[PDB]
Amino acid sequence: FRKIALVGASKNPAKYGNIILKDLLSKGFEVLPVNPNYDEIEGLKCYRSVRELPKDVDVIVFVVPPKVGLQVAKEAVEAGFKKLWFQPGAESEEIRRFLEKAGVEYSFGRCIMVET
Ligand SMILES: *SCCNC(=O)CCNC(=O)[C@H](O)C(C)(C)COP(=O)(O)OP(=O)(O)OC[C@H]1O[C@@H](n2cnc3c(N)ncnc32)[C@H](O)[C@@H]1OP(=O)(O)O
């Protein structure tokens, strides 16, 4: 990965949306936070939705509840994104069903900070 969008990025230091953002930046990744609550996180422009993301994002990492994730994954696929990574707790079989049908690459059960 080079350019990573982070759905559920947060300014709350107790939340994985913040911990992951800081970790990935520390590792030299370009990270684009996505969360309607924030206009910036760590000074970085924060996107309202995945529909606004630049088309050269390599992967979208999800750290939101599965009910939210299903909606966002639909938006991401509609916007042309094809690599969707779900942090443990963000996945569901309904998401799996939609993603297998859409024919996009996805990851369940793998920890992004471990894998990077
Ligand atoms: S793998 C080893 C490390 N472990 C993890 O990374 C564990 C990850 N999983 C979890 O923490 C939980 O299982 C999940 C459900 C993934 C996340 O739990 P949260 O309690 O943190 O979930 P929140 O409801 O607080 O959501 C996280 C942030 O996402 C924001 N959010 C809601 N809806 C959207 C949409 N549509 N788009 C972008 N972001 C969205 C929430 O508002 C929240 O951010 P805050 O601003 O902090 O509220």
Side-chain angles (χ1 to χ4, degrees), residues 1 3-47 49-50 52-66 68-73 75-81 84-96 98-100 102-116:
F1 304 135
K3 196 172 180 175
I4 299 174
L6 181 59
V7 171
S10 179
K11 284 175 93 85
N12 183 348
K15 287 270 190 46
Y16 275 110
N18 194 256
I19 303 157
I20 296 165
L21 179 50
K22 290 188 188 159
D23 181 73
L24 294 179
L25 292 171
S26 81
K27 291 167 174 175
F29 291 97
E30 174 171 4
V31 194
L32 281 66
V34 175
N35 185 330
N37 287 159
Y38 311 113
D39 74 319
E40 61 77 28
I41 309 172
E42 289 299 294
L44 298 170
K45 161 77 177 188
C46 187
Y47 294 79
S49 84
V50 295
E52 300 169 1
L53 289 167
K55 305 289 169 183
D56 68 345
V57 162
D58 295 331
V59 62
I60 300 175
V61 174
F62 290 68
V63 70
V64 295
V68 176
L70 185 67
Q71 304 156 12
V72 177
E75 293 162 25
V77 167
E78 204 201 347
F81 298 102
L84 309 182
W85 180 295
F86 297 81
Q87 286 293 97
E91 83 288 343
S92 79
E93 294 306 312
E94 185 162 17
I95 290 174
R96 200 197 296 278
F98 163 77
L99 294 182
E100 288 289 3
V104 305
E105 297 179 66
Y106 70 86
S107 181
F108 282 12
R110 288 199 288 157
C111 294
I112 195 65
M113 306 187 274
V114 171
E115 303 301 324
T116 59

